[PDB]
Amino acid sequence: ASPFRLASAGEISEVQGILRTAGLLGPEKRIAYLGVLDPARGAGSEAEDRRFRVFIHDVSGARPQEVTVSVTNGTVISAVELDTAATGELPVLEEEFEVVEQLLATDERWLKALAARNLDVSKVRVAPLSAGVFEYAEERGRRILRGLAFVQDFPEDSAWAHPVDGLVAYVDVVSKEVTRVIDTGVFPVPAEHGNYTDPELTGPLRTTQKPISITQPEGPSFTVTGGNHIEWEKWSLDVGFDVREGVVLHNIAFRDGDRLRPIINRASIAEMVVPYGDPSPIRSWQNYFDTGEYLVGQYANSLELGCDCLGDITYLSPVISDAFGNPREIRNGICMHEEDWGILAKHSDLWSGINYTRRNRRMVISFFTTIGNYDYGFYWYLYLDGTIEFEAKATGVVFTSAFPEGGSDNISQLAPGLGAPFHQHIFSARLDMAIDGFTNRVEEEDVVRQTMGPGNERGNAFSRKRTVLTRESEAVREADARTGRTWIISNPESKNRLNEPVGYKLHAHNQPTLLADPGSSIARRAAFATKDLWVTRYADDERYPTGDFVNQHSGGAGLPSYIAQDRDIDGQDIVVWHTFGLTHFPRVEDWPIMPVDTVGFKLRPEGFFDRSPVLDVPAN
Amino acid sequence: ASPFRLASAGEISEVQGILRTAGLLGPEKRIAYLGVLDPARGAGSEAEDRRFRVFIHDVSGARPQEVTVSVTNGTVISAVELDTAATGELPVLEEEFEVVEQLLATDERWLKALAARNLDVSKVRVAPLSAGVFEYAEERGRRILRGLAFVQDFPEDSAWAHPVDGLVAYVDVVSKEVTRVIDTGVFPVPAEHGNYTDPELTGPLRTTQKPISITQPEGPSFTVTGGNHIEWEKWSLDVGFDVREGVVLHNIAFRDGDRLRPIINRASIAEMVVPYGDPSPIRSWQNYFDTGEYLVGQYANSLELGCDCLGDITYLSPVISDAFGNPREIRNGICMHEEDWGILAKHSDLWSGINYTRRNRRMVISFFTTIGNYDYGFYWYLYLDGTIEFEAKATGVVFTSAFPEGGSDNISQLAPGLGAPFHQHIFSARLDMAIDGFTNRVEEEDVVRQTMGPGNERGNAFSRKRTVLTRESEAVREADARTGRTWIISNPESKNRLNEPVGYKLHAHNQPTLLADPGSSIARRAAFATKDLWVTRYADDERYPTGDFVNQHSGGAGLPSYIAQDRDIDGQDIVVWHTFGLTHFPRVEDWPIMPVDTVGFKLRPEGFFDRSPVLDVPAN
Ligand SMILES: O=CCc1ccccc1
Ligand SMILES: O=CCc1ccccc1
Ligand SMILES: [Cu+2]
Ligand SMILES: [Cu+2]
Ligand code: NA
Ligand code: NA
Ligand code: NA
Ligand code: NA
Prior knowledge:
Chains A, B: The active site is at residues 290, 374. The structure is a homodimer. The first copy, chain A, is mainly β.
C-alpha cells in the first residue's frame, strides 16, 4: 500500500508493455535508466499513482528520449526528444563495455600500436572510460568513449597489473568509428602479476584466526513490513533502491513518546566523481562519475552470508530493468542488521554510590557496488542516541599506469615499472531535510576565541557564533576545521522544553575538496565538489548536483544553476548537499588489492530532544 | 623474565619495606605516585634491575621527596627533597577528596553562605578541584584545593543536578585553613533531579532489544604469555599499566615474514586537560589535568563481563600502591579482545571472473577511568592491515552551573535554571617511535595544487610535498585540514623493495586546539595543547608534556623547555607528541548522563611493507 515500496517485477513488465505499445521500444532502443518517481509534495490525497522515469537510447543514431509513464493508469505521461549536444548524453550502457575493445581490435592504427609493443590483440583488455568534454570539436553531440589498454596474460590474470601506457583511443560507439588513436611512445608493460589469489604471491594462508560467532538467538530487534519499511529502536524509515543512486532512505523519523517526529525526508548519495591528477595526455581527461555516468545501483553485488554480511542478516533483493525492459532481480543486494556498538553511557558516582553502564548499538543498511576496477560499500547507520551516519568504504584495485623512469610528481610507484596516478574520490550527499516538519533553516556555527581583557580577565573564555543562511546565494559554504565549523539544521517553529528551536548538527570530516584548477573542465562539470556545503530550496526537478545527463555535458548544470534562483531558505522546505571525499596518494600497501579506506559524515541531535533519548535503554 | 612485566604485589611490598627501613615512610608520609621505570636505552646487557619511582608527600608540612628504589637490589638509588614553590606540588591524593568538604563544614564564612541559601550543610557535597596558578600570592608553595558545592537531596541523589552557583572557597589542605570564601551572589539552586535510574525520569524500560550473542567457540586468536605479552595476527607487544598514564603499550612490532619489525617503542596518553571557558570568577580558574594532577590509572574501573566488555574477554588485573605502600589490585581493570571489523578487501573483476572478499578484525585493549563527574574509556586498536588507532570515549556527567537569567555566551542550558559551561577535553599522545629501529625522521606532507598552464594544460594535475623536520625548534607544527596535512614517520636507513624509506603516516582528526588566550595561565601550563604536533629527541627524563609535577606549577615546564635544546631529530631516536581533543558545547541530550562522544588518531603504514600485508588472510 505504501507509495515508497520497492519497484516490483510486475511494475517493470508493465512499463515495458506501455513503452512497446506507444511505439517507443523498437529493436533499436535501449533503456539506459529506469526508476520510480517519488510522490509529489502534499501526497495527503491518498491518490496512488506509481510513475516511472525512463531514458531511452537509440543505437541507430536517432535522438534519445526522456519518458514518464504511469503504471497505475497504463499511460505515457510525457515523452521528450533530447538534443544531446545541448543537455548531455545518456548514461553508459553495460553493453557498451565490450564495444570499445571490439571496435579497436579491427582498427589499423590500434593494431599497429600493439604490434610495435609485441602485444597479442586477443590478450588486450580495453577499459571503457567516459569521455568528458575537452578540446575536440568533433565530439559535440556524439556519444564517445575513451579506451585505455591492459594486458591479460591468461583468462584469470589481473589485467590491472599490466597497463599499456603511452596509448589512448577515442571511439564513437553509435557510428562505430575510431575517431583518434594517440600513441605518445613505448613504455615497458609492467611484468609482475597482481594475482592476489595466487599462492606464490600470498604465501601459505594464516591458520591463526579463530572464528568469531555473532548470533541473535531471539532474532533481530527490527521489523520489516510492506517489503521495505523498517522499525527499529524508535526509528522508522523506508529503504528504497534506485539504479542510479543505489540505496535511498525515505521518511526517516524517530518515535519520541507518542509523536513520530520526522528528521530527514530523503537521504541519498546523489553523485560521486573520481578525478585524476596526472597531467599526461594519456590520462589528463580521466574523470568518471560512477553515479551519474555509469549508475552504481545496476552494478550492486549479491552479498554472501558470512563473508559480506556477518550476523543475523535480513536481505532485500531489489528489482531493476535491463536494457530491454525486462525485470532483473539483484538477489541479496541489500544487507540489513543490527550491530553492538560498545558503551553507550557510563558513570560511577563517588557521592551517590550508583554504578551505571549501558551498551550502544546501531542499525546497518548497506550495499556494495563494483564498476570496473573499483568497489565501494555504502553504509547507512542509525544509532540508539539519534545519530545518523553515512560511511563509504573504498576498496578494489587502484587504476594503474607505467611508472616513468626518473619518477613523477603525480604518480606513485607500486611495483617495478608500475605506477598509480593520484586521484580523489568525492561524494555528494543529498539530504532533503525535514527536522520536525518541512519548515527548516541552516545555521553555520563557528568557535569564537575571546581576547583577555575586561569581562575575560583570566583569558579563558571562549564562545560560539551562529549565522543563519537566508538565501541560496549565501548558502555555498566551505569547511573550517580550525574554527570547529559545523552546520545546524533547525526548525524555528518547533521548540524543545527550553524554548529553543529543535535541531540536528552536521559533523563533516573536513577532507580536501576538488583540487583541480578552477578553470578546468572538471571544475565546471563537478562544480558541486569545489565546496563543502550547499543549501537549496526544494524543487521536484532538482535531483542531482550535476544535473540529469552528466555524460559529456559541457558544464554548469545542477547546483550552480539551481542556486542562481536565489530562493528563500530561511524557514522553508530545504535540501542540504554535502561534499566529502578522499584524496588518494596510492601506497605500496594498496597493491595488488586495496585494503578498505573510509570517509563519511554524521548528524547528531542538537536540542532535538528534551533530554537524553536513551534513558529507557535496559541494563543488558 | 621480561623487564616490561606488570608490577607485582611482591614488588610493591618490597618497595614499602625499603622505604620504611630507610626512614622515608613514617606516619606523616603518603605515597602520591609509585610506578616502575622503563629500562634504559641499550638494555641488551640482560642486567635485570627493576626500579620504581616514588613521590612521597608529608601531611605535617615537611618537604615532599622524590625517591628511586631498586627492588632487585633492595636499595634506595636516590632521594631528593622538593621545593614545591619552584618545581610544583605533588598530585592530588584520593584521601584529600573528603578533606575539602570537611574543612568547609566548620568555617563560619562557608556556613553563613549556606545559611543564606537555606542549605543544610549535611547535604552539601564539595568537589575537590585543582587550583592552578593565578593572582593569589599567598598560594605559592602551599598545597591548595578549590571547592565548588553541589546539593544532594538524599544519599542516592545525583548532586550534579543541584550546583550552588555564586560561591567558591579555597583551602590549604596541609595547614587545614580555609584561605578565602568568595560569594558573588545568590543563584537559585536548580530543583529538577538528574537521577537517570529513577523510573519517573526513564519511563518504562524498552522491551524491544533482542540479545546480540558474540562468542568464540575455539577461543580467541591472541595469546598472552608472561602475564602481559600479546601476540595477535603478526602483532607483538607488551601491555603495561602505570598509575599516572593508565594503559601503556611497549614494543609494538609486526612479524613480516621472518623478521620482527619494530614500529613503536612506547605509546601512551601522557597528559590530558579539561579547560573551562566560563569567565565567571566562580569557575574561571577551572582547568583540571586528570592525568597529571589526579592520576587516571588509580581510578580505573573494574570492568564487568557482558556490560563493559562483550565477547570472549581476557582480563588483566594491574596492581598499584595505595597511599601507605600496600599493594592494591584493580580486578579486571583491563579488557582485551578481538572484534570483527567488517570488510577488509573486496573485488569482483569483470575480466578475470574472480570474486574475492576478506573480512577485517581488530584487537582491542581498553580501560575505563572515573574522576569525579567524568568517565573516560581509553581504547587502543590494532588492525590486520597494520593500522594502529587510539580512541577516547568521553561520557559521565557534564559539570554544571546555574543558568543565568537572560542567558550566557559561555554556558548552555540543560534544564530549567541548570547550565553547563563550555569546555574542551584535550589529550596528548606520547609516541616514542621505532619505525624499523630507532633511526627515524618526521616529514610534514601537504597537498599541492597546481595552476593550469604549460605542463598542466587541462588544469587537472595535483601533487604533494614533504618537508623534513630537522631540529626541535622547527618541529612544532599545526594542522591544516584544507591542505590534507599529515605527518610521516620514516626510517631513512631502511628501505622497501622500491628503494623508498619505510614509513607510517599519522592521520589527525584536525579538531581545534586550546582556545584560551595565549597570555592566560592555562596556555602557559598546558602549552602542549596549543599545537597539534611536537617532535623531540628522546631523553630518559622527558616523560610528560607538562613536566613531572603539574599541580600548581607556574608554567612552561615540559615540551616548551624540552624543544629549547634544539636537538637533531633528522634520523635520530625521536618522540612524537600529538595533541587532539574535543570542544564541548553541551547539548540538552548530554543531560542527565552523557552519551559517548569520541576523538582519537590513527597511524597507517606508508610504504612500510612491500605490498598489502593481508594477502595471506583466509576466506572465512
Ligand atoms: O568506474 C568507471 C570507470 C571504469 C569502468 C570500467 C572499467 C574500468 C573503469
Ligand atoms: O576530574 C577532576 C576534577 C574533579 C574531581 C573530583 C570531583 C569532581 C571533579
Ligand atoms: Cu583511490
Ligand atoms: Cu565535555
Ligand atoms: Na552544452
Ligand atoms: Na526539505
Ligand atoms: Na615556579
Ligand atoms: Na624513538
